[PDB]
CSV table of C-alpha atoms and ligand atoms in Angstrom, one decimal:
chain,number,residue,atom,x,y,z
T,5,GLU,CA,90.3,76.3,78.2
T,6,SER,CA,93.9,74.5,78.8
T,7,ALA,CA,95.3,76.3,75.6
T,8,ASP,CA,93.9,79.4,76.9
T,9,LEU,CA,96.0,79.0,79.9
T,10,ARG,CA,99.3,77.8,78.2
T,11,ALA,CA,98.9,81.1,76.3
T,12,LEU,CA,98.8,83.1,79.3
T,13,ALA,CA,101.6,81.1,80.8
T,14,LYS,CA,103.7,81.9,77.8
T,15,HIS,CA,103.0,85.4,77.3
T,16,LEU,CA,104.0,86.1,81.2
T,17,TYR,CA,107.4,84.4,80.7
T,18,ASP,CA,108.1,86.3,77.7
T,19,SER,CA,107.0,89.4,79.8
T,20,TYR,CA,109.0,88.1,82.6
T,21,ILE,CA,112.1,87.5,80.3
T,22,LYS,CA,111.8,90.9,79.2
T,23,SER,CA,111.3,92.9,82.4
T,24,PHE,CA,113.8,91.0,84.6
T,25,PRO,CA,117.6,91.1,83.1
T,26,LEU,CA,118.8,88.8,85.9
T,27,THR,CA,116.7,85.7,85.8
T,28,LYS,CA,117.1,82.5,88.1
T,29,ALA,CA,118.5,80.5,85.0
T,30,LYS,CA,121.4,82.8,84.9
T,31,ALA,CA,121.5,83.1,88.6
T,32,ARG,CA,122.0,79.7,88.8
T,33,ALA,CA,124.9,79.3,86.4
T,34,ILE,CA,126.6,81.8,88.2
T,35,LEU,CA,126.2,80.1,91.6
T,36,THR,CA,127.2,77.1,90.1
T,43,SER,CA,133.7,84.8,88.7
T,44,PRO,CA,131.7,87.1,90.9
T,45,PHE,CA,133.7,89.2,93.9
T,46,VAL,CA,133.4,87.4,97.1
T,47,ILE,CA,132.7,89.9,100.0
T,48,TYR,CA,133.0,87.8,103.2
T,49,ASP,CA,134.4,90.4,106.0
T,50,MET,CA,135.0,93.9,106.3
T,51,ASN,CA,138.3,93.8,104.4
T,52,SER,CA,136.8,92.2,101.4
T,53,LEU,CA,133.9,94.5,101.2
T,54,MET,CA,136.2,97.4,101.5
T,55,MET,CA,137.9,95.8,98.4
T,56,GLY,CA,134.5,95.1,96.7
T,57,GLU,CA,132.6,98.5,96.2
T,58,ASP,CA,136.1,99.4,94.0
T,59,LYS,CA,136.2,96.2,92.2
T,60,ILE,CA,132.4,96.1,91.8
T,63,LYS,CA,125.7,99.4,90.7
T,64,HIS,CA,125.3,102.4,93.4
T,65,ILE,CA,125.6,105.6,91.9
T,66,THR,CA,125.4,109.2,94.2
T,67,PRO,CA,127.4,112.5,94.9
T,68,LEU,CA,129.8,110.4,96.9
T,74,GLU,CA,129.9,102.5,108.7
T,75,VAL,CA,129.8,99.2,106.6
T,76,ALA,CA,126.2,98.0,107.9
T,77,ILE,CA,124.7,101.4,106.4
T,78,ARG,CA,126.3,101.1,103.5
T,79,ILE,CA,125.3,97.5,102.5
T,80,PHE,CA,121.9,98.9,103.8
T,81,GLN,CA,122.2,101.3,101.0
T,82,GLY,CA,123.2,99.0,98.5
T,83,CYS,CA,120.1,97.0,98.9
T,84,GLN,CA,118.1,100.1,98.7
T,85,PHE,CA,119.6,101.0,95.6
T,86,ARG,CA,118.9,97.2,94.3
T,87,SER,CA,115.4,97.7,95.3
T,88,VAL,CA,114.4,100.7,93.3
T,89,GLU,CA,115.4,99.1,90.5
T,90,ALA,CA,113.8,96.1,91.0
T,91,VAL,CA,110.2,98.0,91.6
T,92,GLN,CA,110.6,99.4,88.3
T,93,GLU,CA,111.1,95.9,86.8
T,94,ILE,CA,108.2,94.7,88.8
T,95,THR,CA,106.0,97.4,87.7
T,96,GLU,CA,107.2,96.7,83.9
T,97,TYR,CA,106.1,93.5,84.5
T,98,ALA,CA,102.7,93.9,86.4
T,99,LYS,CA,101.7,96.1,83.2
T,100,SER,CA,101.9,93.2,81.1
T,101,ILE,CA,99.7,91.1,83.4
T,102,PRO,CA,96.6,90.6,81.0
T,103,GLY,CA,93.8,93.3,82.7
T,104,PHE,CA,96.1,94.9,85.4
T,105,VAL,CA,96.0,98.1,83.4
T,106,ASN,CA,92.4,98.2,83.2
T,107,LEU,CA,91.9,98.1,87.2
T,108,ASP,CA,91.2,101.6,89.0
T,109,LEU,CA,94.5,103.0,88.6
T,110,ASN,CA,94.1,103.7,92.6
T,111,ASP,CA,94.2,99.7,93.1
T,112,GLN,CA,96.9,99.2,90.7
T,113,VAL,CA,99.1,101.5,93.1
T,114,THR,CA,97.9,99.7,96.1
T,115,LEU,CA,98.4,96.0,94.4
T,116,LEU,CA,102.1,97.4,93.4
T,117,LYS,CA,102.4,99.0,96.7
T,118,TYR,CA,101.8,95.6,98.9
T,119,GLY,CA,102.9,93.3,96.2
T,120,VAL,CA,106.5,94.8,95.2
T,121,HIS,CA,108.3,93.6,98.4
T,122,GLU,CA,107.0,90.0,98.3
T,123,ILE,CA,108.1,90.1,94.8
T,124,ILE,CA,111.6,90.9,95.9
T,125,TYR,CA,112.0,88.4,98.0
T,126,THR,CA,110.8,85.6,95.8
T,127,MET,CA,113.3,86.6,93.2
T,128,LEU,CA,116.2,87.5,95.8
T,129,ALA,CA,115.5,83.5,96.6
T,130,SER,CA,116.9,83.1,92.7
T,131,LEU,CA,120.2,84.7,93.7
T,132,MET,CA,120.5,82.9,97.0
T,133,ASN,CA,122.0,79.5,98.2
T,134,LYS,CA,122.6,78.4,101.9
T,135,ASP,CA,125.5,80.7,102.1
T,136,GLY,CA,125.4,83.7,100.2
T,137,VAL,CA,123.5,86.3,97.7
T,138,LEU,CA,124.6,87.6,94.4
T,139,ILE,CA,124.8,91.4,94.4
T,140,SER,CA,124.9,94.0,91.7
T,141,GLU,CA,123.5,91.7,88.7
T,142,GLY,CA,125.8,88.8,89.9
T,143,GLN,CA,129.4,90.5,89.9
T,144,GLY,CA,129.6,89.9,93.6
T,145,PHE,CA,128.5,87.6,96.0
T,146,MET,CA,128.2,88.3,99.7
T,147,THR,CA,128.1,85.6,102.3
T,148,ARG,CA,125.3,84.8,104.4
T,149,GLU,CA,127.8,84.7,107.4
T,150,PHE,CA,129.3,88.1,106.8
T,151,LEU,CA,125.5,89.5,106.5
T,152,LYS,CA,124.9,87.8,109.8
T,153,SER,CA,128.2,89.0,111.4
T,154,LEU,CA,126.9,92.9,111.1
T,155,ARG,CA,126.1,94.9,114.3
T,156,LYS,CA,122.9,95.9,116.2
T,157,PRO,CA,119.8,95.1,114.3
T,158,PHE,CA,121.3,95.0,110.6
T,159,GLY,CA,122.5,91.3,111.2
T,160,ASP,CA,119.2,90.2,111.3
T,161,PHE,CA,117.8,91.9,108.0
T,162,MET,CA,119.0,89.0,105.5
T,163,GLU,CA,118.5,86.1,107.6
T,164,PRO,CA,115.0,85.4,107.4
T,165,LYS,CA,115.3,86.1,103.7
T,166,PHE,CA,117.7,83.1,103.7
T,167,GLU,CA,115.8,80.9,105.6
T,168,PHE,CA,112.9,81.4,103.3
T,169,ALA,CA,115.0,80.9,100.1
T,170,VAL,CA,116.5,77.7,101.2
T,171,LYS,CA,113.0,76.3,101.5
T,172,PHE,CA,111.5,78.2,98.8
T,173,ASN,CA,114.8,77.1,96.6
T,174,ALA,CA,114.1,73.2,97.2
T,175,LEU,CA,110.9,73.5,95.4
T,176,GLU,CA,112.9,73.9,92.1
T,177,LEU,CA,110.8,76.4,90.4
T,178,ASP,CA,112.0,77.8,87.3
T,179,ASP,CA,111.7,81.1,85.5
T,180,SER,CA,108.3,80.3,83.6
T,181,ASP,CA,106.7,79.0,87.0
T,182,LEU,CA,108.0,81.7,88.7
T,183,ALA,CA,106.6,84.4,86.1
T,184,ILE,CA,103.1,83.1,87.1
T,185,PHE,CA,103.8,82.8,90.8
T,186,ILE,CA,104.7,86.6,91.0
T,187,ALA,CA,101.8,87.7,88.9
T,188,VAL,CA,99.4,85.6,91.2
T,189,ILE,CA,100.8,87.5,94.2
T,190,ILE,CA,100.5,90.8,92.3
T,191,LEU,CA,96.9,90.3,91.9
T,192,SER,CA,95.8,89.7,95.4
T,193,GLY,CA,92.3,90.9,96.5
T,194,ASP,CA,92.9,91.0,100.2
T,195,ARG,CA,95.3,93.9,100.0
T,196,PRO,CA,94.2,96.6,102.6
T,197,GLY,CA,92.2,99.9,100.9
T,198,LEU,CA,91.4,98.3,97.6
T,199,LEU,CA,88.5,99.6,96.0
T,200,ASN,CA,87.3,96.9,93.6
T,201,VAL,CA,88.4,93.6,94.7
T,202,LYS,CA,86.1,91.6,92.4
T,203,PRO,CA,87.5,92.0,89.0
T,204,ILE,CA,91.3,91.7,90.9
T,205,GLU,CA,89.9,88.1,92.2
T,206,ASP,CA,88.8,87.3,88.7
T,207,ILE,CA,92.3,88.3,87.4
T,208,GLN,CA,94.0,86.1,89.9
T,209,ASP,CA,91.4,83.1,89.9
T,210,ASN,CA,92.7,82.7,86.2
T,211,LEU,CA,96.3,83.1,87.0
T,212,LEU,CA,96.0,80.2,89.8
T,213,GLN,CA,94.5,78.3,87.1
T,214,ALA,CA,97.2,78.9,84.8
T,215,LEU,CA,99.7,78.4,88.0
T,216,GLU,CA,98.3,74.9,88.6
T,217,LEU,CA,98.6,73.6,84.7
T,218,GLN,CA,101.9,75.1,84.8
T,219,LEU,CA,102.9,73.1,87.7
T,220,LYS,CA,101.4,69.8,86.7
T,221,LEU,CA,102.8,70.4,83.1
T,222,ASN,CA,106.4,71.5,84.2
T,223,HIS,CA,106.8,69.6,87.6
T,224,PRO,CA,104.7,66.1,87.1
T,225,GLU,CA,107.0,64.3,89.7
T,226,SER,CA,105.9,66.4,92.2
T,227,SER,CA,102.8,66.2,94.2
T,228,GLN,CA,100.9,69.1,95.9
T,229,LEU,CA,103.5,71.6,94.8
T,230,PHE,CA,100.9,74.1,93.8
T,231,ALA,CA,99.8,73.4,97.5
T,232,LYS,CA,103.3,73.7,98.8
T,233,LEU,CA,103.9,76.9,97.0
T,234,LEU,CA,100.6,78.7,97.9
T,235,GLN,CA,101.6,78.5,101.4
T,236,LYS,CA,104.9,80.3,100.4
T,237,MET,CA,102.7,83.1,99.6
T,238,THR,CA,101.9,83.8,103.1
T,239,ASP,CA,105.5,83.2,104.4
T,240,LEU,CA,106.4,86.2,101.9
T,241,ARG,CA,103.8,88.2,103.5
T,242,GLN,CA,105.1,87.8,106.9
T,243,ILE,CA,108.5,88.2,105.7
T,244,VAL,CA,107.8,91.7,104.5
T,245,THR,CA,105.7,92.5,107.4
T,246,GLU,CA,108.4,91.5,110.1
T,247,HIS,CA,111.0,93.6,107.8
T,248,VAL,CA,108.3,96.7,107.8
T,249,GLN,CA,108.6,96.6,111.8
T,250,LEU,CA,112.7,95.9,111.9
T,251,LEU,CA,112.6,99.1,109.3
T,252,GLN,CA,110.9,101.0,112.1
T,253,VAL,CA,112.9,99.7,114.7
T,254,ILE,CA,115.8,101.5,113.7
T,255,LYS,CA,114.6,104.6,112.0
T,256,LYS,CA,114.8,106.2,115.8
T,257,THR,CA,118.4,104.6,116.8
T,258,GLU,CA,119.8,104.9,113.2
T,259,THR,CA,120.8,108.5,112.7
T,260,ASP,CA,122.5,107.8,109.4
T,261,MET,CA,119.5,106.1,107.1
T,262,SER,CA,117.4,108.1,105.2
T,263,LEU,CA,115.4,105.7,102.9
T,264,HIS,CA,115.1,106.2,99.0
T,265,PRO,CA,112.1,108.3,98.3
T,266,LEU,CA,110.3,105.5,96.3
T,267,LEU,CA,110.6,103.3,99.3
T,268,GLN,CA,109.6,105.4,102.0
T,269,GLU,CA,106.5,106.1,99.6
T,270,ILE,CA,105.8,102.4,99.4
T,271,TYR,CA,106.6,101.5,103.1
T,272,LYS,CA,104.5,104.8,103.9
T,273,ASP,CA,101.3,103.0,105.6
T,274,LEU,CA,102.7,99.6,104.8
T,275,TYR,CA,101.9,97.4,108.0
Z,1,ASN,CA,95.9,104.9,96.6
Z,2,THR,CA,96.5,107.4,93.9
Z,3,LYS,CA,97.0,110.8,96.0
Z,4,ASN,CA,99.8,109.8,97.9
Z,5,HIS,CA,102.4,107.4,95.8
Z,6,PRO,CA,103.3,110.1,93.2
Z,7,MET,CA,106.4,107.8,92.2
Z,8,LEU,CA,104.4,104.7,92.0
Z,9,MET,CA,101.6,106.6,89.5
Z,10,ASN,CA,104.1,107.8,87.4
Z,11,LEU,CA,105.9,104.3,87.0
Z,12,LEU,CA,102.5,103.0,86.2
Z,13,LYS,CA,102.0,106.3,83.6
Z,14,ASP,CA,104.2,104.6,81.0
X,301,LIG,C1,122.3,91.5,99.6
X,301,LIG,N1,122.3,92.3,98.7
X,301,LIG,C2,121.6,91.7,97.3
X,301,LIG,C3,120.2,92.2,97.7
X,301,LIG,O1,119.9,92.0,98.5
X,301,LIG,C4,118.5,92.9,99.1
X,301,LIG,C5,118.1,92.9,100.0
X,301,LIG,C6,116.9,93.6,100.9
X,301,LIG,C7,116.4,94.4,99.9
X,301,LIG,C8,115.0,95.2,100.3
X,301,LIG,C9,115.6,96.4,100.5
X,301,LIG,S1,116.2,96.9,102.0
X,301,LIG,C10,114.9,97.6,102.8
X,301,LIG,O2,115.1,97.6,104.1
X,301,LIG,N2,113.7,98.0,102.0
X,301,LIG,C11,113.9,97.1,100.7
X,301,LIG,O3,113.3,97.4,99.7
X,301,LIG,C12,116.8,94.2,98.3
X,301,LIG,C13,117.7,93.4,98.3
X,301,LIG,C14,123.1,93.5,98.4
X,301,LIG,C15,123.9,94.1,99.4
X,301,LIG,C16,124.6,95.0,99.2
X,301,LIG,C17,124.3,95.9,98.1
X,301,LIG,C18,123.4,95.3,97.1
X,301,LIG,N3,122.9,93.9,97.3
């Protein structure tokens, strides 16, 4: 029933607004004034002007900035997943497995909302770190962000809004082919109805773009690959890199990821 | 799964 799918779409958009303080609409409104970090000197100036708390090399520091952002993103995503009808019924083991494999895919999806072709909103939109600077970084740090920027440029061309993204994100979380799932049957059934809600959502909200649903689902596999390539580049520098020690939440997520 | 991932479980708990 179309109306039951419009009621699922509305519930997810309402929960998405409640779960994610920096939405794409606010991000677009800003990107169209945050402190611009574009080189070494503007970075050092930036973190005194500007979302990092602890007891106390630039590449490592920026990396710990992103880690800190991740940990809070997982918390928003977890609070959002819990509102997806039927998620809090799945085998608690499988809730954990969906979270585990879904959380970075959502992070990069929502990171695209904060990106344009030249940089990214940081620290809830009070900063803007340039793509060039991120690329200029040394060793393998200059390659962390670049695939995200390339994904975001293509993904942002779809012109999804937050109401679109609320269902797309939910579709991603409820993937039935995550390694180690116990009960894939009720997960696929939840996902199947989210996909119907997404499809109706895209035909109502984007009547003019044919095959947007098709283009969107192909992006889902892009996201999986981005995370897989990040997993490895993370395991690359856990050998050379002496100064990095991943946040506990993140080393738990990454543990036997890929 | 649930054995490992205590941090995930506790975010899911409430
Ligand atoms: C570029 N920005 C915006 C956020 O950009 C992000 C880039 C990567 C991640 C994923 C982290 S990083 C990692 O290796 N594992 C994770 O979960 C999360 C956010 C910065 C940069 C510095 C400080 C704060 N914000």
